[model samples]
Target: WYHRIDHTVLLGALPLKNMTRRLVLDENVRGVITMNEEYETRFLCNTSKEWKKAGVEQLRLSTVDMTGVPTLANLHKGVQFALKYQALGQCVYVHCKAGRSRSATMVAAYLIQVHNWSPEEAIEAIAKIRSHISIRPSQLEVLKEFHKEITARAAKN
Candidate 1:
């Protein structure tokens, strides 16, 4: 899970620190899935070279606008990738430049789409996981929009 705020620091950072110990990178999803599927899962922070050096194949191809900009484009992309990756039983680290806004929004959308949950239920579920996870106001708007967007898009196609 990723956010725009420093949720890790709020949670005392142990989860991120533990990520350093068992991290590895595999260019292929099959290899990555085999390594982590049977174990307890945890997400990691990929904020720097040192964190990357810990061997997490950070899904950094993501782009989440932090300037209170709302766009469905990137959220859709990240959600699709996360859904596919999760099907392989991989624990995904959905982080933004920070760990609050973008991350929270994306996770909220994914839970709704993949689990067939309502937007309100999805938000509550994510909050349950990490109490500090927050979808900033602008992000909440996009998330509400995307909830409808996904359902409508599915019907059209």
Candidate 2:
């Protein structure tokens, strides 16, 4: 159902099986970053709302699949959510349609920005685990730009 990217993050597809609630509760997941589009998650729209009832915050960043890379703002929003929850000692699950490209993009940006890793290092580290992730060119470019922007900010501070 998910791959442990590290202590802070679990990467996976849409939650189903026994139930999303059970999975999150048992894993102590306090936050979920959904990277799928509107139609992709409509069937279980209420599931996310249910997560809030169980004290799991849902950061829904609806990114179109393959059409384009998520905006830089979108990546920032996802990274902010993941970092915030991780610092609280809670796991954050990042999901797209197939637990591949889009979600991996978000996680890679998190690595690039927070861990200060190169795109190759970040992507390869994750791909080494998940194996199915396919990060395309546009998404890769966005990640490079994201790295450039955040690295600059980190330096100034």
Candidate 3:
């Protein structure tokens, strides 16, 4: 199932079958940000490479093991890429295996970076639409640090 968060974004579970379901979905989605391994996600749909065949954009960033965390650089670049698609007038789909922690973190962080929201505010906003959303504690900690860093940079200017 998928939860449409806004005009530009949706959060959902990974599709298991890489055939018609994905092809049909590709019709509507302009881009995808996947938080799973390339091979694993390929089992669901045509990936970034094959997305070209479907005429949609795809970006895959793997979190270090499901139990671990993604690097700050990866998170930053992934969100930037997602926003690029959205800015181009496309609805972006962000998904993980279960569509919870990793995906949630990306969306929440995007909200923070794009909207200048505190992590709490971003999570609250996301929860209103995606009830199952729950970012990992470690991920939140990293986000908090990122928030501090960004805010400090602003103060310096």
Candidate 4:
């Protein structure tokens, strides 16, 4: 099942088979940011074109499954991608192989960077609903750094 991190943000696995079109409509999803690498999923290759034609904005930020730590810029990009449609009152889905780590990391970083939540608390908020989430140490560190950067940026202003 897909998990809601907020009204506009959702977390789930790579939409396999017909799940993409179905869930896009079912969830009113307007944007999708995929964390899966090109080699990881054979699904969205040209199919992303199909979704785009149907008015779904897709951003593919391929990160190595368990080892790649999401960088600050990438988190910023993902958050921006989601917020773009969210500003229009639309939903955005963020996914990886599973919603457990990579996607969950994105959501956690979203909360941290956008909502001004502490890294641990942001992670806690997501883990509150999705118990299977397991964010790796490097990813966790990046989230903390993202938090620090956001806070520092805010302080500068």
Best candidate according to lDDT = 2
Write the candidate numbers in order of decreasing lDDT. 2, 4, 3, 1
Comparing 2 with 4 on lDDT, the higher-scoring candidate is: 2
lDDT of each: 0.50, 0.81, 0.73, 0.79
| Candidates 2 and 3, the one with greater TM-score | 2
Model 1 residue 123 CA deviation (Å) reads 0.9
Decide which is better by TM-score, 1 or 3: 3
Per residue, candidate 4 scores C-alpha lDDT tens digits across 41-123 of 66543367766876788888866445565567888899888878778888888887778988898888778866899988988
Quote each prediction's TM-score: 0.60, 0.90, 0.82, 0.89
lDDT of 3: 0.73
Compare the candidates by TM-score and give the number of the best one: 2
lDDT of 3 by residue, 1-157 (tens): 6777776777877744454245346536777787865563455555566766766677878776754346777778777887897787677778776777788888887788777889888888888887777876777887787677657766887
Residues 7-89 of candidate 1 have per-residue lDDT tens digits of 11111122354444543332122111111111233334334455446543343333343534235776666667666655665
Candidate 3 backbone overlaps, count: 1
Q: Name the Cα RMSD for model 2.
A: 2.0
Which segments of candidate 3 are over 4 A away from where they belong? 16-28, 38-41, 66-68, 153-157
List the candidate numbers ranked by TM-score, top first: 2, 4, 3, 1
